Amino acid sequence: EDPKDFPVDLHAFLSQAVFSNRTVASFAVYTTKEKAQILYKKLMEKYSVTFISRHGFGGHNILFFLTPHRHRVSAINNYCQKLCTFSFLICKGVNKEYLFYSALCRQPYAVVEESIQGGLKEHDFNPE
């Protein structure tokens, strides 16, 4: 059985309003390692990301990315789903950027690749 949602330990950081027509600038994707490998570079280029990271979790991968322009979650999901038939893929907006990335850099998650050397810094966002 493929996952039907992100792991529960990330729920608090994610927006559940997948049909929201508000535009946002931070997204997450949960899919296979094969599809995430491909999407890491495709999304980097498509959305001119300011940051993207790919993380492993129990054989699958999670992508996290930030964009210089805002987008609807539905648009990003549509683009990602184009790659899959087939493979599962969950796409949600991220409400708590630094907390989400931080969780993805601690067990049980691991960073596999990221687009800025040294990753995101706490000081790159305002405090909570």
**Three-state SS letters, 101-119:** HHHCCCCCCEEEEECCCCC
117's CB contacts (< 8 A; 6+ apart) are: none
Q: How many CB atoms neighbour CB 77 within 10 A?
A: 18
Chain Cα centroid distance, residue 60: 13
Tell me the C-alpha distance between 14 and 77, whole Å: 14
Tell me the resolution in Å.
1.5
Strand pairing report for 51-57 and 89-93: unpaired
Beta-bridge partner residues of 55: 62, 111
Walk me through the domains of the chain, giving residue ranges and CATH numbers.
1-128 (3.40.1310.20)
Determination technique for this entry: X-ray
- Enclosing H/E stretch for 77: helix 73-82
Structural contact between residues 109 and 119, judged by C-beta atoms closer than 8 angstroms:
no
43, HSE (Cβ side, Cα atoms, 13 Å): 36
* Tokens 């999304």 -> residue: 43
Structure tokens at 124: 């790159």
Tell me the C-alpha distance between 68 and 91, whole Å: 18
Tell me the C-alpha distance between 13 and 84, whole Å: 25
Structural contact between residues 58 and 6, judged by C-beta atoms closer than 8 angstroms:
no
- Going across the sheet that includes 89-93, the strands are 89-93, 24-32, 60-71, 51-57, 110-114
Q: Which of 65, 69, 23, 66 is nearest to 40 (CA)?
A: 65
